[PDB]
Every structure is written in structure tokens, then in C-alpha cells.
Amino acid sequence: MECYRCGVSGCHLKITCSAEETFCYKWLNKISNERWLGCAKTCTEIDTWNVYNKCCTTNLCNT
């Protein structure tokens, strides 16, 4: 599986997940609009004053 990740060129970059990294994350800073995307072994959904994070478990799901 792969997930999207972000760099200077945008958030369309692809990264291979290990077998244990069964999540793609999409972590958004609600204050700065920073996007943090990738593969992870653990993923907790978050919806606070400053953070939104969504978790998903299929290839390139963190659009």
C-alpha cells in the first residue's frame, strides 16, 4: 500500500507503507493550514481547536 505525503511541491507525493503501517493519515493544522500526510502504524482521529486528523486503511486514501 501507498499513501500520499506532502513536500514543497504539494501533497500528491506517494510513499510506500510497510506492512505494519496499515493507515494513511491526514493531519491538518486548523490554525496554520499545514497538511501532514503519510503512512502510520497507529492513527487516532482528532478534532480539537487546533488539529483535525483522519485515518483510513486503503491505498492512496488520504486525498
From Swiss-Prot:
Gene Ontology cellular-component annotations: extracellular region
Instruction: For this UniProt record, give its keywords in alphabetical order, as a comma-separated list.
Output: Disulfide bond, Neurotoxin, Presynaptic neurotoxin, Secreted, Toxin
Q: Which cysteines are joined by disulfide bonds?
A: 3-24, 6-11, 17-39, 43-55, 56-61
Keyword presence, Secreted: yes
Kindly list the GO molecular function terms attached to this UniProt entry.
toxin activity
Entry-linked InterPro entries? Snake_toxin-like_sf, Toxin/TOLIP
Task: Please verify whether the record's keywords include Cell division.
Answer: no
Location(s) in or outside the cell: Secreted
Alphabetical list of Pfam families matching this protein: Toxin_TOLIP
Q: What is its main location?
A: secreted
Tissue expression per record: Expressed by the venom gland.
Taxonomy, superkingdom: Eukaryota
Explain the purpose of this protein. This toxin is described as enhancing presynaptic acetylcholine release, but neither experimental results, nor references to other sources are available.
Q: Which family does it belong to?
A: Belongs to the three-finger toxin family. Ancestral subfamily. Orphan group XIX sub-subfamily.
Report what the protein is called: Bucandin
